[PDB]
Write a protein that holds these residues in place. Structure first.
Motif, short mmCIF file in Angstrom:
data_model
loop_
_atom_site.label_atom_id
_atom_site.label_comp_id
_atom_site.label_asym_id
_atom_site.label_seq_id
_atom_site.Cartn_x
_atom_site.Cartn_y
_atom_site.Cartn_z
N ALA A 159 99.05 -15.69 70.75
CA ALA A 159 98.72 -17.17 71.12
C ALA A 159 98.42 -17.92 69.85
N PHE B 155 99.64 -17.12 66.53
CA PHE B 155 100.76 -16.95 65.88
C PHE B 155 102.05 -17.49 66.45
N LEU B 156 102.34 -17.15 67.64
CA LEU B 156 103.24 -17.79 68.57
C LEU B 156 103.37 -19.21 68.42
N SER B 157 102.11 -19.74 68.79
CA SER B 157 102.10 -21.16 68.80
C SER B 157 102.09 -21.64 67.24
N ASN B 158 101.66 -20.94 66.40
CA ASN B 158 101.47 -21.44 64.73
C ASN B 158 102.94 -21.33 64.29
N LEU B 159 103.83 -20.04 64.77
CA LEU B 159 105.38 -20.11 64.62
C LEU B 159 105.86 -21.50 65.27
N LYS B 160 105.20 -21.80 66.50
CA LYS B 160 105.93 -23.06 66.96
C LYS B 160 105.38 -24.17 66.24
N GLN B 161 103.92 -24.23 65.85
CA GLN B 161 103.56 -24.85 64.87
C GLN B 161 104.33 -25.04 63.53
#
Lengths: 224, 74, 5, 62, 80, 305, 206, 168
Positions: B41, B43-49
């Motif tokens: 959550a 990295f997946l959001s940081n990747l989204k970020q």
């Protein structure tokens, strides 16, 4: 019975025992102090195939029969095999020389090959469009390109490793290099720990499921 | 007391087995739940970020270039 | 079943 | 064929890439090290010509 | 038995609120696979070389436009 | 050379027959090669049981090795003292990476003398990789009783641990408890397999046993069939259960009708195999009776279904 | 020819795959032949029935060394749905825990006390005596095989026999024994410890 | 249902059909009944129960001896059950009731009166013997084979119908 033998080699996969030929160099002569232990240096040539790969077992056992017991061994052996896929197994085609764990590695290394090829053909088919792949028998390189942040790129490597023991260690590498167009646009720490966090992600979902969710998360943000 | 000792050890054997299973579950749940989301959550959001070390692609390109000769021999 | 026939 | 046209493009492309790989001496360091020939993922004009004569005739025959 | 009972109760209720935490973690997830490879991340970490290679890779990208594409096509024929 | 030890050795030396005197006296190691020639083993029973025990009087025999003598006696006479089968069960996890015979001997004796403080536990790691525990019992109020010991044949890393069903006292739940805590298991369960032939219980619990022109027989199509069905239920070389294969029936006669069937044969699974061909039994011979080794069970407790 | 050029496959399947299967009716009989490296002695007869809820009929997978026998029944709890997978994950255990049984049979003299073992030789705990130098302090080598798949031991403890810290010689001997046991099996180690520990020097206090 | 004259005779073929639940003893009796080299073809038949699965080409059966093992009540419950599938014209002469196990008198689950009552209420000879021992078999075999030549008509003066008039 032979059709059932082929079936047995199909369910209990000996993995396509195709061209088998057993020769025998009888070495029960008097050179070995005939009063003492006996030996027989058998040799086989077994051309067999994988689902895609093949193998030819030019294979010479030393079969020792002592006066009360038999203690088989292997003196010489030759595999007509493949390149990088068997380069780590080329350590074994010397290790079997310094066979059973060749068909225990390959029996399980072709499991790695299936889990690589079919997973690649799943990711490049179900979700194409931007999920490019260096499509090759040995090239585990997949291209990713996002659009809202205009310069991000990611590649994941589904590497191979057979130990000296023969256990397949599927290395799941994530070689990261975002180009300098959006390299300094996110300014987050999601890319420095990406090679580390991918090891966790394959513990989040399955090995293939983690990669699929990785694709669906780090490239589909422009689509939404 | 000896029969009580056998019963308590039987509980102590059962308690030991239950505590071992519970601690195994504790460690597994700690690792999975605590670190997954704090990494996924994140990295997946940081990747989204992000979307919404310079030798890695060089090595990938060298492997792809050697793959040209490999496929030529293949 | 527990083959009591 | 489109692949044959790509192969015809590859035939032009193969010559172009070969010259570049000789001028770039920095990339020559690769595959020239004991920690690269083993750990870094472990004359082909005639092979490229074979990758053209045995890739156009064979693909068409496929 | 009483110490392992403090354990059974404490870890029991603790993993009850921790399976509440685990449901919360799946809700975060809402919106030897790695144990064997737990030490392979050090190779990722392992400048003048970086810049020269990247500049060469940009020229090699043009080479890869004909080379990698041929490889992506030759293997596609091999795969098919 | 002690009380309940010298005469115990005497009572276990007249037990062993004359033929295998050398075989058992060589293995228990107190009589070295030089000591064997002193006593003339071929003369008489009371002569040898008096000279041999003297040869331990000079050897100062102790119960630790006197019990080992009894162990070696039973290793060749295991076909007496009907054996229960205990089945251990670890939960979820890796196996017992540490069954050190020294550690298992420690983790068994310590737990057993924790409650049964006066016991003479004597192990003998056999060559078939199966520790042959012998336990002489006795509570804290009494001395360890070697009259009726409880030999426990624990196969070393096996979940199954045979047990001499001597008396089934309050130590039996401690026999299983010490067994399952010494070997790193958690649950001890009596398999309820109880046979006199340990060499057949070993086969069963390990599944180690199968691995004229004028006389016109009119019922030949039926004899062939019954021979067929007695060869797909009893394949080849059945093991002698030789045990009271109980079937404590609780079924209604077609409320229930209690029964306590006890098949009793010197060789049971072979006796059943020659039943249907002999006309006593029907061809499909009631899996309750065929699946004695297949279920690894003979002391059945069936109900209706 | 097919009665010789194809029947030889079952002869070839014997000395290869470690997985030969006799085509017995009502269940194939996988004559699993276990092997170490280029020496091989023994075979295990895992015997099944071809009947959908998978019953193992009466196996010959090591009752005396039963963790494979446990892995014959408790790997079924892990993987038995793929006999594909089991017969690698059982040939693994058979080829590992016969290896450890072979990783003993060489020794007969170099060691002094008996090779205290386990079934599968899960703990190869032997009090040998390798004395390169004369000052005798043996290592009671306890190889703790944490996993039953890796032929090489996992946890190595070549512990000095009840003695304090010695000179740097025996310390680096213990350290070299650790890394030579974890990476190389005793067949190529204790036949090379006779090679490197020449003359087989014996002990004085031990 | 077996009938005496359903098939045609041969020439010297005297086809007797033994009936008994135990079949090893029937095989022994058949072996002893063919041990002597008599003057008649002796296609002995064995069985367990009189339904006698319907296979054509079965010769004209000239004798059915119901070997009733007195040791086992099954041999009577499987004879009395099999006695209801014999033609009433078959019970006249061509039926004997062997009672093996008689004389031992300690294993007899069946009182020998019961076999006497059964063999009298069906009006047929009842020949005691002890089939387990060859000394009493190799003489009962020569009694069944001379009853055989009577029922099969090989002795040219006595029918099976005349036979039961002698053994009443």
């Amino acid at each position: 019975h032979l059709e059932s033998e082929l079936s047995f080699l199909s369910t209990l996969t000996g993995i396509n025992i195709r061209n088998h030929s057993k020769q025998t160099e009888d070495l029960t002569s008097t050179e070995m102090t005939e009063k003492s232990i006996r030996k027989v240096l058998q040799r086989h040539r077994l051309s067999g195939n994988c689902h895609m790969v093949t193998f030819q077992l030019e294979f010479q056992i030393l079969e020792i029969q002592n006066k009360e017991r038999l203690s088989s061994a292997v003196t010489d052996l030759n595999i007509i095999m493949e390149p990088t896929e068997c380069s780590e197994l080329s350590e074994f085609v010397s290790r079997a020389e310094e066979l059973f764990m060749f068909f225990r590695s390959l029996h399980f290394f072709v499991e790695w090959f299936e889990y690589r090829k079919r997973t690649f053909k799943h990711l490049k088919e179900k979700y194409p469009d931007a999920v490019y792949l260096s499509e090759g028998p040995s090239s585990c390189s997949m291209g990713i390109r996002s659009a809202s942040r205009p310069g991000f790129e990611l590649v994941i490597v589904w590497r191979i490793q057979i130990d000296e023991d023969g256990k397949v260690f599927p290395k799941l590498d994530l070689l990261t290099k975002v180009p300098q167009r959006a390299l300094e646009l996110d300014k987050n720490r999601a890319i420095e720990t990406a090679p580390l966090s991918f090891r966790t992600l394959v513990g989040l979902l399955g090995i293939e499921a983690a990669l699929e969710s990785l694709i669906k998360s780090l490239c589909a943000e422009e689509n939404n | 007391k000896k029969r009580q000792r056998m019963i308590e050890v039987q509980d102590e054997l059962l308690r030991l087995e239950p505590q071992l299973k519970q601690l195994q579950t504790k460690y597994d749940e700690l690792k999975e739940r605590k670190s997954s989301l704090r990494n996924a959550a994140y990295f997946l959001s940081n990747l989204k970020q992000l979307y919404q070390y310079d030798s890695s692609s060089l090595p990938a390109l060298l492997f792809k270039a050697r793959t040209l000769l490999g496929a030529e021999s293949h | 079943e527990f083959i009591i026939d | 064929d489109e692949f044959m046209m790509l192969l015809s493009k590859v035939e032009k492309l193969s010559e172009e890439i070969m010259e570049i790989m000789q001028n770039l001496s920095s990339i020559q360091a690769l595959e020239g090290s004991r920690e690269l020939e083993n750990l870094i993922g472990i004359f082909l004009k005639r092979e490229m010509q074979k990758t053209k004569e045995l890739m156009t005739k064979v693909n068409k025959q496929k | 038995v009483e110490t392992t009972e403090l354990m059974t109760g404490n870890i029991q209720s603790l993993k009850n609120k921790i399976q509440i935490l685990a449901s919360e973690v799946e809700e975060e997830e809402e919106r030897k696979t790695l144990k064997a490879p737990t030490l392979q991340k050090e190779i990722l970490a392992l400048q003048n070389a970086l810049l020269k290679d990247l500049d060469i890779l940009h020229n090699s990208s043009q080479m890869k436009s004909m080379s990698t594409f041929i490889e992506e096509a030759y293997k596609k024929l091999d795969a098919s | 050379m002690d009380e309940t030890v010298a005469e115990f050795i005497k009572r276990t030396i007249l037990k062993i027959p004359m033929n295998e005197l050398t075989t058992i006296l060589k293995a228990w190691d107190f009589l070295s090669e030089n000591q064997l020639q002193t006593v003339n083993f071929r003369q008489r029973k009371e002569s040898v049981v008096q000279h041999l025990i003297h040869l331990c009087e000079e050897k100062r025999a102790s119960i630790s090795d006197a019990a080992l003598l009894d162990i070696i006696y039973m290793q060749f006479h295991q076909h007496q003292k009907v054996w229960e089968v205990f089945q251990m069960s670890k939960g979820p996890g890796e196996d017992v990476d540490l069954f050190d015979m020294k550690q298992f001997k420690n983790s068994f004796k310590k737990i057993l003398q924790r409650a049964l403080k006066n016991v003479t536990v004597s192990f003998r790691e056999t060559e078939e990789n199966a520790v042959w525990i012998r336990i002489a019992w006795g509570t804290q109020y009494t001395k360890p009783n070697q009259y009726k010991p409880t030999y426990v044949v624990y196969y070393s890393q096996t979940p199954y641990a045979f047990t001499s069903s001597s008396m089934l006292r309050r130590n039996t739940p401690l026999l299983g408890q010490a067994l399952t805590i010494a070997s790193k298991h958690h649950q001890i369960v009596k398999m309820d397999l109880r046979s006199r032939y340990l060499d057949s219980l070993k086969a069963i619990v390990f599944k180690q046993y199968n691995q004229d022109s004028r006389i016109i027989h009119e019922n030949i199509v039926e004899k062939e069939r019954v021979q067929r069905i007695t060869q797909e239920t009893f394949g080849d070389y059945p093991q002698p259960q030789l045990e009271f294969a109980q079937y404590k029936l609780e079924t209604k006669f077609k409320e229930p009708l209690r029964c306590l069937i006890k098949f009793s044969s010197p060789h049971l699974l072979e006796a059943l195999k020659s039943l249907a061909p002999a006309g006593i039994a029907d061809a499909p011979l009631s899996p309750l009776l065929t699946c004695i080794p297949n279920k690894r069970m003979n002391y059945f407790k069936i109900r209706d279904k | 020819e097919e009665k010789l050029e194809n029947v030889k496959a079952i002869l070839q399947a014997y000395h290869f795959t470690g997985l030969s299967g006799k085509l017995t009716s009502r269940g194939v009989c996988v004559c699993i032949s276990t092997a170490f490296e280029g020496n091989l002695l023994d075979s295990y007869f895992v015997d099944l029935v071809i009947q959908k809820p998978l019953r193992i009929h009466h196996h010959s997978v090591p009752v005396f060394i039963p963790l494979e026998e446990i892995a014959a029944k408790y790997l079924q709890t892990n993987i038995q749905h793929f006999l594909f997978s089991l017969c690698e994950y059982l040939n693994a255990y058979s080829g590992r825990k016969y290896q450890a049984d072979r990783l003993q049979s060489d020794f007969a003299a170099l060691l002094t006390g008996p090779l205290q073992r386990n079934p599968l030789c899960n703990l190869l705990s032997f009090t040998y005596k390798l004395d390169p130098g004369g000052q005798s302090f043996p290592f009671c080598a306890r190889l703790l095989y944490k996993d039953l798949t890796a032929t090489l031991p996992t946890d190595v403890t070549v512990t000095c026999q009840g003695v304090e810290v010695l000179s740097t010689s025996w310390e680096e001997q213990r350290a070299s024994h650790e890394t030579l046991f974890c990476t190389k099996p005793l067949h190529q180690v204790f036949a090379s410890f006779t090679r490197k520990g020449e003359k087989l020097d014996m002990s004085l206090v031990s | 249902v077996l009938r005496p004259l359903d098939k045609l005779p041969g020439l010297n073929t005297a086809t007797i059909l033994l009936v008994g639940t135990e079949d090893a003893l029937l095989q022994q009796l058949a072996d002893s009944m063919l041990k002597e080299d008599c003057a008649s073809e002796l296609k002995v038949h064995l069985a367990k129960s009189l339904p006698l699965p319907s296979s054509v080409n079965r010769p004209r059966i000239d004798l059915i001896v119901f070997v009733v093992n007195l040791h086992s009540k099954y041999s009577l419950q499987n004879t009395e059950e099999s006695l209801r599938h014999v033609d009433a014209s078959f019970f006249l002469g061509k039926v004997c009731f062997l009672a093996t196990g008689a004389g031992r008198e300690s294993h007899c689950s069946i009182h020998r009166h019961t076999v006497v009552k059964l063999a009298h209420t069906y009006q047929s000879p009842l020949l005691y013997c002890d089939l387990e021992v060859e000394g009493f078999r190799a003489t009962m075999a020569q009694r069944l084979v001379r009853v055989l030549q009577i029922c099969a008509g090989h002795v040219p003066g006595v029918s099976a119908l005349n036979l039961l008039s002698l053994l009443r």
